[PDB]
From Swiss-Prot, chains A, D:
Keywords: Capsid protein, Virion. It comes from Enterobacteria phage PRD1. GO terms for cellular component: viral capsid. Homotrimer. InterPro entries: Phage_PRD1_P3, Phage_PRD1_P3_N, Viral_coat, VP_dsDNA_II. It is found in: Virion. Major capsid protein self-assembles to form an icosahedral capsid with a pseudo T=25 symmetry, about 66 nm in diameter, and consisting of 240 capsid proteins trimers. The capsid encapsulates an inner membrane and the genomic dsDNA genome. The major coat protein P3 and two assembly factors (P10 and P17) are needed during the assembly of the virus particle inside the host cell, when the capsid protein multimers are capable of enclosing the host-derived membrane, containing the virus-encoded membrane-associated proteins. Pfam families: Phage_Capsid_P3 (PF09018). This is Major capsid protein P3. The keyword Membrane does not apply.
Swiss-Prot record, chain E:
The chain holds residues 347 to 384 of 395 of the full protein. It comes from Enterobacteria phage PRD1 (Bacteriophage PRD1). This is Major capsid protein P3. Major capsid protein self-assembles to form an icosahedral capsid with a pseudo T=25 symmetry, about 66 nm in diameter, and consisting of 240 capsid proteins trimers. The capsid encapsulates an inner membrane and the genomic dsDNA genome. The major coat protein P3 and two assembly factors (P10 and P17) are needed during the assembly of the virus particle inside the host cell, when the capsid protein multimers are capable of enclosing the host-derived membrane, containing the virus-encoded membrane-associated proteins. Homotrimer. It is found in: Virion. It comes from the Viruses.
Length: 371, 370, 374, 371, 38
């Protein structure tokens, strides 16, 4: 136990020194403009330099609705669905995050404490506001019109700007990293009336005649350069750099009215946050199809069994607003769910109404060691 | 000497408790009723671990049975769904005893923004007021029924990380008492021209408004699995021997252009002060006040400010203004504390004073159990 | 050789004394002066603050009534609007040393940057309880119609100390001999109103009725924030000597010579530790939302850019700092945790590579920095 | 001073031994063919082997003019604008060269002593000549036609084949180098009549309908292998390997008729050469818009204040011809401009005529130490 | 009587804040100064 306490102390000190001595850099890695009808999957090759903290991905797109008369309107996720999936592999080909664009975006929001890169509305007479359209998409695209969209995603390796847990040391000249981006295409972006809008950007009677004109992306890599050297070479937080900080998502089915649907935290990961999306057969409701949600331990005791509005209240304290309809969030950052500290734990949803093809899309944020 | 070590130990124990125990939020009671029959309830919380506070959810349906006239929300609106709250701990010592609106304003001051609100942004992703956590229709038309939702946090502990004021109830045995007095058909509706201070809706149809029903659910927040050491449970004795209370009072006797001073009592460490200028039923946006201040006898004013400048300081604390006639003062970093009664006072020099004018004061403070 | 231990010890002593001062003294905010005037008669004032204890800064309240006397045309707020009620502010301490010397718009943008949101603004929420813009702390009508009179209110915080907890830059004002001086150069009928097609940079309103707009009056009230009842010890008053011997200043400048697709570089001077940088691209009177820029960057002698970004990505970083965008053509850069200091690395420069350059284009730079009094 | 003189002697000896003992190698690192409409920025990863001297980049392209009737003609820089920008970072992520394709190309020419990789015309009856089209581009591309282009750039690390100053030691398996190439696209390559041709390849009335069909690049890495080992490990020229030899460019504006426009050598670098391009508002003139050019020291004295033709005469002695219109060169190789030897120095241009949006594009070649 | 003299480059500057700026505007500076030969 002394070897550990000293190991953690050494790690923190090394982290603190790296942060004080190195200088942060953010620089463009690659940009590409394309038509997803031609290609929608791209493998970006990050530069191998210093300690890598994450990637900021700018995505723009132009969409045209050529329907003769009908419009389409943004889905609840809208531009967050411009990227369908993101997967990162480090120089040792160890996979870190692999999740959907919508889940990654919701975590970006949770970590910011407000809708990611949004512009807050105030009474200021000075002309602050949505000036630069950092994340933007027209509410509707009428028949015959073309809309322009902009979206940003932060793909994290390091947990934060000050906590390097999960960061990647990329100083091995011949071992490349891989950032795979799978973009939306005409098939995923447009949903007909009555179809499931989960993965779509726009939905409406004009959907069949909507097409992307183009999508463009620019990946910026954030890293620390001029790493401090000491009496043993680079001073590095060994625990930070051998821990993976990942996001992943999965789908669970088998819900029945008034019965507890339990999703066990199946791995021995340290779960920092959990997102549960109740895709009630293509319908996304504002809590009205749920009796309660909870986190429960094998001891059968609930640490937070709450009605939907009260559950939402806790989230409002975290992001200053509510996540979209049917999206529920749970913060476990200070005391991560770890099944080896207490019995197995489960995330619980007791549904009031269950439509055909109902399912819970689970999104997790967690730490785990490489070994 | 000493103390340095007493506080050092207290803080160490607090840290161990926060690190080792596990937080739980649990429903302890729910009830639906008709205020025509009853509006005062005494909730019995569970005696388990260290209790931090209670989240009280209140929902109500209001029917405007008037034939042709509507009513509209007052400035406090749903914050008046609970008229008063009183908490007694296992040792029969009272902590908070205040109005629902004062409790709500403190919840907002502590959050740094309107309590449990949804902030509006340009995000195209559909975040927003999706769940209507705190909600009430702006107006209820003649013949219509409106649905309202309100939440209040009754604190024992000062915060999630500062357990000062928390209550140990894992042992006490004796019961705790959380008393709640709800709005009723006599307090919720104000006629045109009547004082709207304690009401939820005001308007020409008020006389014919009534509650269809009210429901409440109390959730208790506490720490379980308390850490044990040599001498036994590791506990922050100072935290648990200190009361963190909210209290209200009313003062009258205001006259144009004369300093109206409300004295702070001794012994209490006042963290915040709220003063509501109920100018005879009229609530103005500072236009009826010359200035406000906090003053020490023989040391003058530490912050004598015009109303807008006073409001500017508040905008730095809650990112907006409190409702008309509601003034806030933050003294958290250096609490008002006098060894002599009234060695410090809160001042309001009114420009205009209507009949039946008064200041409704609200205080947040720390004080020793002994 | 070494002996640098002195610095280490000096820093510790400075921090200890700062803490003692913060713990023992009591904060006071007090009115020092209020005046109502007609800008046609005068617009420059020199305020003499009180010499009491350690001065942290000044909160300046400014109100105005503007009438648009045009027979038919209206005027509308410029992007800066009421932030241009004060054109320039300059502070001198008792030793007659200059601290902040900048434009009202720059001071206001820094007030916003340090708050983490539009300065003293009222956010909008779904709360049914009537919070909101109740007190109109900073306010100005979006337009003033022909024949109408509009009322404005704006506030500026002129900092001496860096913050309420970091007294770096604060001023000890106890010498009865020499006075401090806070100079305010206000807007007047020649700066506040821009005709259609004229440069709106320094104006409050712009539009077809501008030539007939006039101030009815402007009023200001200066409140001084300071620490009184300073703690004493064996060696007398306990005081953070480094904090009180360091200047925390805001200054602005102007540079021209931009050409399409060529890097325009503005060098940071040596000795100053730059906490933030603001660059306003006054493209010949046109202020655009990034569309006239290829990219912006901060660069060191080594061709090494630490953040060469396209305008929207640059704007994204700013949204993380103030929760919204600064007005069109206004770009912000936060270097608070690692201040730009040309001694730490080679010379450093702020870069703008413009896509389009109109005649009379220029970059207006605003800086926040720390520097030794000596 | 003795420590230095001995340090320099040791460096030269080490350099001489490395050159005598090692064997030079040039080998392909990577090849890619693409459409710049899809992607135009590439991060190439050089191999980490021995001492790296530089990279030879072969670039080919096919351009089609689909205008109904109008042609386009090469700009003065032409194929040199196939690469817009090049940036290199070494294994420690220290940036070396970062400049435009046209500036890099002009330095390649200056260092060769003749237009880079050109074929000289002679009266020889034997069929020497432009046989292999090493650097080539059709003078015009008519409406409806497709032209093929070939261009080469040498990206230097080492100053020359015999002077290893600026070379990079790349023998650290996990620290990768980065060679970023930003290519031309339809937006940069084609200029309409009257538009600024500076960055373009072709200009003419058919520009709006011109498009790249494809661009291909092949990067060859030149390095020294089988490094000599002695009584202390590798015998290495320590000064050579810790000195950066870089190219950089910038733009300066503020010119007015008959007034000296001075561009201060702002850094403490040892400037080997200076290139000044007078982009007179999109017009490039053969000296007629200039009174004189000069290099001047704080002492206000000029070391070479010359009329344009005489300035050009000095350049003809260096590259056996003139650089394109508006491009001026200054050789300071034997006595580099170094502001710490004499007062600050400046490059001067006194313009005779100044159009709107006039500016001087400055290109520098210099040495500077890592520390 | 008190010559502008800085130990650091540009520790002092000459300032002109223009009201009107035409195309091709510029300031032509002229200086009188003393300096050591060495």
């Amino acid at each position: 136990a002394l070897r550990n306490q000293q190991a953690m102390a050494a790690n923190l000190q090394a982290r603190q020194i790296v942060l004080q001595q190195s200088y942060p850099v953010i620089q463009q890695v690659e940009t590409q403009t394309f038509d997803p009808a031609n290609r929608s999957v791209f493998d970006v090759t990050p530069a191998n330099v210093g300690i890598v903290k994450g990637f900021l991905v700018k995505v723009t797109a132009a969409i045209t609705n050529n329907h003769a008369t009908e419009a389409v309107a943004l889905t609840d996720f809208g531009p967050a669905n411009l990227v369908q999936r993101v997967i990162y592999y480090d120089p040792d080909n160890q996979r870190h995050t692999e999740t959907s664009g919508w889940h990654l975006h919701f975590v970006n929001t949770a970590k910011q404490g407000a809708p990611f890169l949004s512009s807050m509305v105030t009474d200021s007479p000075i002309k602050y506001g949505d000036v630069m359209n950092v994340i933007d998409a027209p509410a509707t695209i009428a028949a015959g019109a073309t809309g322009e969209l902009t979206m940003y995603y932060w793909v994290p390796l390091a947990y934060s700007e000050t906590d390097l847990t999960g960061a990647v040391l990329a100083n091995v000249p011949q071992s490349k990293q891989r950032l795979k981006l799978e973009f939306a295409n005409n098939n995923t972006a447009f949903a007909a009336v009555g179809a499931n809008p989960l993965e779509a950007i726009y939905q409406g009677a004009g959907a069949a005649d909507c097409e992307f004109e183009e999508i463009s992306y620019t990946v910026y890599q954030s890293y620390l350069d001029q790493l401090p050297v000491g009496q043993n070479g680079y001073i590095l937080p060994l625990i930070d750099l051998s821990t993976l900080y990942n996001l992943e998502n999965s789908a669970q089915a088998g819900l029945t009215p008034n019965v507890d649907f339990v999703v066990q935290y199946a791995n021995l990961y340290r779960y920092l946050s959990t997102i549960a999306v109740f895709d009630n057969g293509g319908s996304f409701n504002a809590g009205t199809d749920i009796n309660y949600l909870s986190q429960r331990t094998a001891n059968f005791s609930d640490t937070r069994k709450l009605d939907p509005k009260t559950w939402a209240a806790q989230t409002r304290r975290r992001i200053a607003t509510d996540f979209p309809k049917g999206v529920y969030y749970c913060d476990n950052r200070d005391k991560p769910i770890y099944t080896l500290q207490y019995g197995n734990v489960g995330f619980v949803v007791n549904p009031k109404t269950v439509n055909q093809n109902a399912r819970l899309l689970m999104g997790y944020e967690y730490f785990t060691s490489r070994t």
